Design a protein around this nucleic acid. Structure first.
Lengths: 84, 104, 73
RNA sequence: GAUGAAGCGUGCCGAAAGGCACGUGGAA
RNA sequence: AACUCCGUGGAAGCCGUAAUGGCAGGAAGCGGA
RNA sequence: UAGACGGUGGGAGAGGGUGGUGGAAUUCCCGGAGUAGCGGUGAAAUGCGCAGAUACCGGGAGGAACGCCGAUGGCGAAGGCAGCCACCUGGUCCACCCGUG
């Protein structure tokens, strides 16, 4: 079949964007574009609520990671500008 | 005709940040041009007036390809607490990438 | 802000002086380059300390609601 | 000589928003 | 001396002030007008 | 991996924000033609009209709303949201069961 060596060959070329904590980064991309949307459109309160909840979820993932590792919640707490 | 493209730019230069030759900054770029070492010049959209015309002449005199983007930060991270910004980049180096090929 | 006025002049007068002047003194994004280094040089006169670009703008804001409509039309 | 506004800094807090303290600054 | 400027140099957090501030559109340093 | 989240692919919508724009109607103004009333009510009167109103045709200006479709319908967390166009943007459903665990 298709063996692990030749698989990682393919991974290294394209380094691998196929999926996953991804979760955090994807939501950063959501947040960023939503923030820019709401830089205009200051009157869109409803989607602004969705921003608040995006930012919240991001933090909870970061805190999750930080906790369930002492290494990743380092970066996460900082990049979220979360905590204090 | 596609779904977002969009920003295959962003992820394209995203790699360069870890992969590697290349030089950032106006002066160093203008230098690369005059030295004729640069291969390509990427300019940010906003980029100051006459500040862009400079890079343009010397890009012309040096026969350097100019790919109009630009520049910025890993926006998502530095956004939060993070960019530095870049108004131009000079491909004296792309490595495991290919932005040089059919794209400007 | 309006604190220089002490207990004089009343609420509206100084609330608006502070409002106008806060906006007034905010970082403003230069039209030529894109840097946030535009400062009022005289009401309606604006300049970027970065590249020196001297612009005509509103009296207390570099851009007015009407000057924006122009760009479109 | 006194009081000490905006602005700015540092620290802490918050996902952000901002908030608090201390300092700086000196307005009228 | 300060200010301005030239060369060099190549900082992606560092330089600087009483304070504001400065920087890859190149900071400090070194050398000059 | 049975919750949750993500991926790829299908979808509906008066969800929100900015700019634009279409036609109907009202008011006013201009021109034309045209007289003695118009309006309004249970009846009336005030009112407007011979400096020519009302009814009619054409031209213009301006503001506000968006007929039919329209539902017993749809969207949103609620308040609430309906002419058309583009841009920016939120939520949400379904299929595959692919990823995190």
């Amino acid at each position: 079949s298709v063996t692990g060596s030749k698989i990682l060959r393919i991974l290294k070329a394209h380094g691998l964007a196929p999926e996953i904590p991804e979760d955090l980064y994807f939501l950063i991309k959501k947040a960023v574009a939503i923030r820019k949307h709401l830089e205009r459109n200051r009157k869109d309160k409803d989607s602004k609520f969705r921003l608040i909840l995006v930012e919240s979820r991001i933090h909870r993932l970061a805190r999750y990671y930080k906790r369930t590792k002492k290494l990743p919640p380092t970066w996460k707490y900082e990049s979220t500008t979360a905590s204090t | 005709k596609a779904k977002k493209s969009g920003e295959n730019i962003n992820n394209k230069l995203q790699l360069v940040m870890k992969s590697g030759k290349y030089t950032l900054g106006y002066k160093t770029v203008l230098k690369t041009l005059r030295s004729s070492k640069g291969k390509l010049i990427i300019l940010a959209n906003n980029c100051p007036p006459l500040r862009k015309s400079e890079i343009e002449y010397y890009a012309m005199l040096a026969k350097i390809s100019v790919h109009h983007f630009h520049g910025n930060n890993v926006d998502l991270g530095t956004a939060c607490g993070k960019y530095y910004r870049v108004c131009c980049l000079s491909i004296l180096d792309p490595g495991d990438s290919d932005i040089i090929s059919t794209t400007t | 802000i309006v604190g220089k006025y002490g207990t004089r002049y009343g609420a509206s007068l100084r609330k608006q002086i502070k409002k106008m002047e806060v906006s007034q003194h905010s970082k403003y994004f230069c039209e030529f380059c894109g840097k946030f280094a535009v400062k009022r040089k005289a009401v309606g006169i604006w300049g970027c300390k970065d590249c020196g670009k001297v612009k005509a703008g509103g009296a207390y804001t570099m851009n007015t609601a009407s000057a924006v409509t122009v760009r479109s039309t």
